[PDB]
Amino acid sequence: ALARCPGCGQGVQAGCPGGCVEEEDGGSPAEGCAEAEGCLRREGQ
């Protein structure tokens, strides 16, 4: 048998729907080099 209710609880049912660590936005590699004051250098594009 199973002595535990699956799906219910708290952090899972109303907290992290899958994972609370989807980067700063969602697979967006823009942390160290994202703004102009982070790595403007001479040429960027």
Give the method used. Answer: NMR
Q: One-letter amino acid identity for 39?
A: C
Q: Are 26 and 19 in contact (CB under 8 A)?
A: no
Q: Are 27 and 33 in contact (CB under 8 A)?
A: no
CA nearest to 45, candidates 37, 28, 36 = 36
Domain boundaries in the chain?
1-32
**How far, in Å, CA of 43 to CA of 36, rounded?**
11
Largest CA distance in the chain: 66
User: In a 3-state reduction of DSSP, which class is residue 37?
Assistant: helix
